[PDB]
Design a protein around this ligand. Structure first.
Ligand SMILES: O=C(O)CCC(=O)C(=O)O
Ligand SMILES: [Cl-]
Ligand SMILES: [Fe+3]
Ligand SMILES: [Fe+3]
Lengths: 291, 306
């Protein structure tokens, strides 16, 4: 890659907590991947992406000053007239990590992103919105969640109506906070968006013209020294009991395979705080990291 | 001290981010503080806060070390940090006033980096009783980890500073702005903390020690015991604590904006810490550390344990 550009991405990431990476991928590679798609198990279901990603870790490692390690490849596709989540920071996506420890993502659009037919992603520099504090707010919310009992009526409603700092930060309050100081960009194939977990962001809806759907890979990474958060996992388990005991069913986050994976390792007892030392991660280590 | 007590103190601070320390000052020290602050207070004119006295740096670092330096060892041990005396404040409340509302030390420790260490010793100069109260309430950082509140407050400050003549009265603009800061009302705090706060009785000689992420407020003083209740507060940082030029600039700009609109003239006690730091910064800093400020570096020995 153009060494001057690389130096600029490193500067930009250091400024905003994110950078758009133009031509990070060969068209070929995108078509390969795109073509293969056209062809407990959700954990590895897309590991064939890993190799494509692994070739780029050195770059990203340089850009961020971290030693990155792939956790999970998710395919995120959805119809054009789709209501997504409002600006958020991924307190859920990275619930398995210590808040202060490092986490980041690569958003890989499989279908072009145009000025028309937006259909991509908006994002706010962490200079403007240092997303870290949002994680603490969320944790306060989780702890309030597990205060519920039957005496207080419907569980989900209790949660939705609880007067918690989290619930207070409504879409308008966020909109008012960021105003127009966000970016949205155009993406040709083989372009990706890289952002750490403190970057407030949101998906934009797609115009009907083209294409059929908006397809993108989303890859979660952490750092070699990124630790688990046992207490948060405690919170989720405790909430999962209340939930099944009452709705006779499980919360939908048991569908996050990384969460499930990390939780089991934890319950089974953890010699170490590092995610790298979780047996399933450790076994596939070299595949998860830079050459 | 006892040794067994000292270990409970350490233990409590580790859990809650605070600890009440009973009988740490002797009555004589207290009387000295009273008299000295009473004199300093008479001399100068000072301007949802419902407090009588809100004076910063009425006395200097040397008067402070004179009764604090011999205690830094206990505090260093409790926090596992190396503490430097920095700035101070005197607060007082009359009966039936709310004093300060819930807050964390984002105002007090404004010119330092959020993640760097800051703590306070709150020394009541009038007895706090179960019957008349007028003390403080405080919340374990286990219940309310106050560090997040700093960003929230910084976002709000940044909005303050976008004010415009078009907007109308500055104070009203600030108070009604739809910022996250403004959303966190007393009701919200109440709902967040519940009954998890603690309120303790204090005899002269007792003090409250707390780091800057602890959420705390004044309690109303019931009439019939004291005409006024005073508390003297010492702010401490770590040897390695750094200046935050960015927040310092926000505060200056907002202060500037406020004085310009209201035609007020902010007075600072000579050798106010804030002023001292603002100059060093305005000159340009050689080092990030507070210790490497020239006035500090010169007076460092008095500021630290023996
Ligand atoms: O003395 C009071 O009522 C409040 C003091 C305070 O907020 C502090 O010492 O940080
Ligand atoms: Cl404070
Ligand atoms: Fe997201
Ligand atoms: Fe305070």
């Amino acid at each position: 890659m153009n060494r001057e550009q690389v130096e600029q991405l490193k500067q930009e990431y250091e400024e905003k907590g994110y950078c758009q990476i133009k031509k990070i991928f060969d068209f070929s590679a995108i078509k390969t991947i795109q073509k293969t798609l056209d062809q407990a198990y959700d954990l590895v279901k897309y590991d064939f992406v890993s190799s494509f990603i692994q070739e780029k870790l050195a770059l990203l490692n340089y850009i961020t000053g971290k030693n990155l390690m792939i956790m999970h490849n998710a395919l995120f596709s959805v119809e054009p007239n789709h209501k997504g989540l409002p600006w958020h920071v991924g307190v859920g996506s990275f619930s398995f990590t210590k808040t202060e420890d490092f986490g980041a993502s690569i958003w890989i659009p499989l279908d072009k992103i145009t000025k028309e037919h937006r259909g991509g992603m908006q994002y706010v520099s962490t200079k403007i919105f240092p997303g870290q504090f949002y994680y603490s707010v969320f944790d306060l919310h989780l702890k309030n969640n597990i205060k519920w009992d039957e005496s207080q009526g419907d569980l989900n409603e209790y949660v939705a109506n609880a007067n918690t700092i989290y619930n207070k930060i409504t879409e308008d309050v966020i909109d008012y906070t960021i105003k127009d100081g966000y970016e949205e960009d155009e993406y040709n194939l083989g372009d990706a968006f890289f952002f750490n977990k403190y970057v407030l962001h949101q998906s934009v809806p797609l115009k009907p013209g083209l294409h059929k759907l908006r397809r993108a890979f989303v890859i979660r990474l952490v750092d070699y020294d990124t630790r688990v958060d046992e207490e948060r996992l405690g919170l989720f388990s405790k909430y999962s009991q209340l939930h099944s005991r009452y709705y006779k069913t499980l919360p939908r986050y048991n569908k996050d395979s990384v969460l499930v994976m990390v939780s089991r390792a934890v319950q089974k007892g953890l010699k170490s705080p590092y995610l790298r030392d979780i047996p399933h991660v450790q076994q596939t280590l070299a595949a998860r990291m830079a050459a």
